[PDB]
Assembly symmetry: D2
Homo-oligomer: 377 residues x 4
């Protein structure tokens, strides 16, 4: 009776990005991969080392290629091995940090992951679908020695969809990303709010906003306004949620309005020169008392996604962790990994809504890393 | 746990097609629908007095619309009712008998089905409220829509296997006897209940969402009738279908076939058939996949119909496939669609009856 | 330098649909084909009678398949001939009258058409589909063997013709109300190569390939009928212009509003027993003037597409004339559809370059004169 | 009567890539762009200058957005400017050197091009994308502001130019071999309109799902020694060298080396793998590509033309290892298109090349037209 499965995820201190050791292949081995909230699928570099007794490449026009949504047939002029076959299916994979994309082949192999009643036994998808993507794609932008990307996007062979389908889980997943490199957070597949902590009602304040999917397969929500200490800075789906930037990203005109109203809410004298890659920094000794950021979601009548000033700030000298996305970012506002860390964020694919707590996880005395004991497993 | 779910399916003697009573809505009610093996999705006429407590039409750009692969937004300039909303998602539904297609609206409601047993549910089963003109011609009497079993993201088997965590496969046991009911079993039937002699052949899915296999040869009573660099190939070229009762052949294959079939025997053809008799029939052997392949065998009498006539039609110069196997060739034959392994399984101690398998 | 190309179009009185003879093949022959304004392409019956020295079925993955936007390969077991090949590309064709669709194969052959009255000029490699013959069985005017699509799709007639000869990316329909005189489709910039009372409204294309405009309001004798970052839910106009239906079609709620308001513009006593296929019929002779229907385009004060009431009326029986507006039920593809009868005796400029549809705000005086 | 249009394109010595100054906007200005033979469209960074009186961003669901194959609507939260509007269309653009792709906005403006040496003729409503600026940051030749695609895609350079002027649906490349020198792209039927094309041979052209031109190589020999097989082949200007899948690379480079004396080999200069002392070589081996099928026509590469001057006294084999999964097992780069007439016939789905060298007629690509 499997109701949840759970993947440990770690915060990479050097990049601010989140990544995981996936258990794949026969025998099981650890494959380090970026966690890309918006990614279409799981892809890894197979050009390398690849040992498995259970690896298979589906044939062109197969049900597996249809499920993966590719009718592009490929062939390789060379002895067959993972990544190189006669008559297989081709899939474009994306490095979401550089935005590079390249052509690889669809593969199947074992993926293993812990079940959890709400720690539990290790269960497997014996023919988990993924792509052997070309190696140039791992060369830039990813945490050291990452070999791939696990996409959690709403696409037919993404992690959440493949896991939910195989185990009959509710078609949703919950992220609890860690703020701290020293301790692993979790991604929970299945209905966490109903099937999952130690007397604490961590979901008590869950509120919901509608979820859309862009044509590029990204999760979008809609922000009705941004207020900083009750002063509105915006206006004047639409909002992407993403783990391919650590920081909040704002379209340039929104960036200028935001940062200026932010500054204004602090003492003018507290401003110091900026350290890269930030624009707006402060002497932190000079004032502890950061403005609160309310994102009013969907429509004027709430609910409110609250960001405390302190959690927007980076200990760089403290700097505002908000980036100028230029004239044409993909979304006018993007909530990045730091906005996800230490919050329970529910992506409900069945009902098309994102759930979020109006109150802080930590108010329960709980950190995302406290959720599961991965050291026993 | 649940590892098997079953839909009773009924043989309609007047059309030669099959149909199920789907259980939907709150409170549950019965929705007669044609079973279309290659259908993309379940659709229904929602002008047919739609009562439900649990009906929703997903909004444009939602997760459900994305899953159904539509980014087309619609609005109905009318009040709000099932099939008429503002800001919902459009999708094309097909009447696969007439081949008509029409733009309808993505809906969500409860569907109930039997486990193997008791009735279990998909609270959010996705389907389409299709335009009512699509139920006017060709369907079995009183049917209100079509339930698609094609390999497409919101087809019946995909939704059910995903919800219950079944093995990605379904088996077909249609009954030959008009008014009798066989079943479609979802999940790993071969391991979860006769499946000793399962041959197997590769399955491809066409761009239009149809199941294909490849037929290397056809014989009538042993007589031959038939016949990451990018590449660019084709599917099998033989379609399995329940949207025709009859075997359909490309004109030239049809001539060869029927003629050779005539020669295995010693009247005034009766419409729509081109070869009829008074009332031993020769056997048809289909070598599957390639020259070494397992053989799909249809005994002659099972091709034959009573207007007795050869139930093999002329699909003209350009049918979808060179060869199509219709409803009658699936009847009283256990056909396993393994979507996880991309192959179709079939029965090479007589056959019992599809109608014997269950009791509802 | 060729500036226009012109195709005569015949009104079939028996169906109200419009058809043309397309000149193709080598040797050149006539192929009678339905004119489908919203159709993706030209499709034609290749069932075995087809024969031509210049016909080829492009190979899968060819530039011609790429242009037609199909990467679906097929093959045929019989001896090779048009419609039947070893490695070709598949294309879905639609009968717009019955809404049947079916898979056929991309074909290529010579098409000839008159320049500007001028000589016959040719497109040597004109792309079209060999469609399954079941597609011609039903709903097509007599003897029709295919459908010429004028849709905004990459191998439609207007696009191929404009492209081959370097015409302006537009065409003008001037359908005839009278079967005995043929009207014209004019490819290229008709307004600058042949009146001035042209109004324009934005043109959008639906995902199924249809032309849409936006009707801000429908009025009858000025009375309102209709009615009282990734951007997300945008839609195209919501009014379709089609030559696949003869009459105006309205979604059932709009239909009822329209009929109630139309009727209110005339004496209740003039009404008479309904006569199929119609729902609102009148004692002819008890009416001197029928209400005008004004479609205000784009915005509440945009340009107006005006229909005279006489032109929306049909005479069914001896002394009884009926309203030529059909009930499209709950889910027509568009809430309002203007049909062949609304396009007859009017110039309509489909400008694909500027995405606008242009129509006269003073109809000639109520198409066959332009050419001969 | 316009039959050909020609674009001077210049060889960049640093990157080995080719680029062009496109004349756009009102008033006209020079917009430097990389020439990407497989590029889907023309894209530019609009953030920067963009001065024009004739720029326009089509609206969502317009005929222009449909042509470009996008039904994705964009809103920009800012005030109106090029690259930033409400209700426009989104298009993904690709930097073909880094393989980065990003979302930009469909735009329309004037593009001027020389007709035939002849006068500047214009496309008033030329479609392109305002692509996000991160796409220009790496790997393009210095100062280029975007990319001009020549792929077989509906709004590519050759398609828009052929359609606007009624050209034959083909183009010929004559890329110049020497740094800063100028070759030409000629749109229209170059072979029939200006024998240097007397010996044109032809091989089937296919288009991949990512929109790249492909042909098939049936075999490769070096000095008549078999290298391949034991043949999908992309033609590209986004790599300056030949690229081979790893097992083909190993065989090719081995056989190439053993045709030369083994003491000729010096230490490898990055990025190359096989380099030589250029004192110790007097003749390089011929590389022969049999196209399409066992008995097809032969694309001949003189071996000297495969070699790169890495240093003062060192010459390297300009053949790169594409690893396990390059897009095509063989790729013919910029260097293989240099000083060679290559005809991309989109109408007939074939690529044409001369069995006899352009230099054996005494001609160089830079000779064809006098630009300035």
């Amino acid at each position: 009776p499997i109701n949840l499965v759970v993947l440990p995820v770690q915060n990479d201190g050097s990049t601010g990005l989140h990544w995981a050791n996936l258990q794949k292949r026969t025998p099981l081995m650890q494959v380090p991969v970026l966690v890309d909230l918006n990614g279409n699928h799981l892809w890894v570099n197979c050009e390398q080392q690849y040992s498995s007794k259970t690896y298979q490449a589906p044939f062109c026009h197969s049900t597996q290629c249809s499920r993966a949504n590719t009718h592009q047939c490929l062939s390789c002029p060379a002895a067959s091995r993972p990544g190189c076959h006669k008559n297989t299916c081709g899939l474009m994979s994306t490095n979401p940090i550089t935005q590079q994309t390249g052509l690889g082949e669809l593969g199947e192999d074992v993926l293993a992951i812990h079940a959890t009643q709400g720690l539990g036994p290790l269960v497997t998808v014996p023919q988990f679908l993924f792509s052997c993507a070309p190696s140039f794609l791992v060369q830039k932008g990813l945490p050291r020695n990452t070999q791939g990307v696990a996409g959690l996007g709403h696409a037919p062979i993404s992690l959440p969809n493949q896991l939910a389908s195989h185990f009959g889980l509710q078609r949703q997943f919950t992220t609890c990303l860690s703020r701290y490199p020293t301790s692993k957070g979790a991604i929970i597949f299945g209905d966490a709010p109903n099937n999952m902590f130690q007397n604490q009602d961590i979901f008590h304040d869950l509120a919901f906003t509608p979820l859309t999917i862009t044509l590029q397969g990204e999760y979008n929500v809609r922000v009705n306004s941004i207020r900083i200490n009750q002063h509105s800075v915006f206006p004047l789906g639409g909002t992407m949620i993403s783990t391919s930037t650590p920081h909040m990203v704002l379209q340039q005109s929104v960036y200028q309005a935001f940062t200026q109203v932010f500054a204004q809410q602090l003492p003018k004298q507290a401003q110091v020169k900026s350290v890269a890659p930030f624009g707006l920094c402060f002497n932190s000794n000079k004032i502890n008392a950061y403005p609160s950021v309310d994102l009013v979601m969907d429509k004027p009548n709430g609910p409110v996604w609250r960001i405390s000033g302190e959690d927007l700030m980076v200990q760089a000298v403290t700097c505002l962790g908000v980036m100028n996305g230029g004239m044409q970012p993909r979304a006018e506002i993007t909530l990045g990994a730091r906005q996800l860390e230490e919050n329970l964020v529910v992506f409900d694919l069945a009902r098309s809504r994102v759930g979020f707590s109006t109150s802080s996880l930590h108010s329960h005395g709980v950190k995302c890393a406290d959720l599961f004991n991965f050291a026993n497993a």
